[PDB]
Every structure is written in structure tokens, then in C-alpha cells.
């Protein structure tokens, strides 16, 4: 998506390079592991 392909994206590559950073990955984790059925605890309020 910049070979000859349109604008943007470049942004996407930046996002994943920073993801490849771990420590931020550790803090990122501070939101998925006990989160995989806790996206379901969102709809609690969305129903409440």
C-alpha cells in the first residue's frame, strides 16, 4: 500500500511496529487475557 498504492497505510505499518514493542505489548495485555469473555461484559451495560 505504497508500492504504487494509495496514500495512507503507511500508518498501518507504524501501528504494527510499535505493537512489536513488547513492554507496550505487556500493557496491551493488561487488556485481552481476562478480556476474551469480557468483551461480553460490555453488553451488560448495553443491556442494563
Amino acid at each position: 500500500m505504497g508500492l504504487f498504492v494509495h496514500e495512507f497505510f503507511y500508518s498501518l505499518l507504524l501501528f504494527d511496529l510499535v505493537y512489536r514493542e513488547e513492554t507496550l505489548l505487556n500493557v496491551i495485555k493488561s487488556v485481552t487475557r481476562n478480556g476474551r469473555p469480557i468483551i461480553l461484559t460490555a453488553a451488560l451495560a448495553l443491556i442494563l
Binding site: 495512507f8 500508518s11 498501518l12 501501528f15
Partner: peptide, 19 residues
């Protein structure tokens, strides 16, 4: 946040005149 600027901005130009 920085991407979802664009994700809006592509399908929706800001369409802003006054606050």
C-alpha cells in the same frame, strides 16, 4: 486514535463550519 481520524475522514469529510 490516529487511524480512526482517517477511517472517518475518508467516508466523511469533516463537514464543519461553526462550533
Amino acid at each position: 486514535v490516529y487511524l480512526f481520524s482517517i477511517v472517518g475522514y475518508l467516508f466523511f469529510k469533516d463537514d464543519f463550519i461553526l462550533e
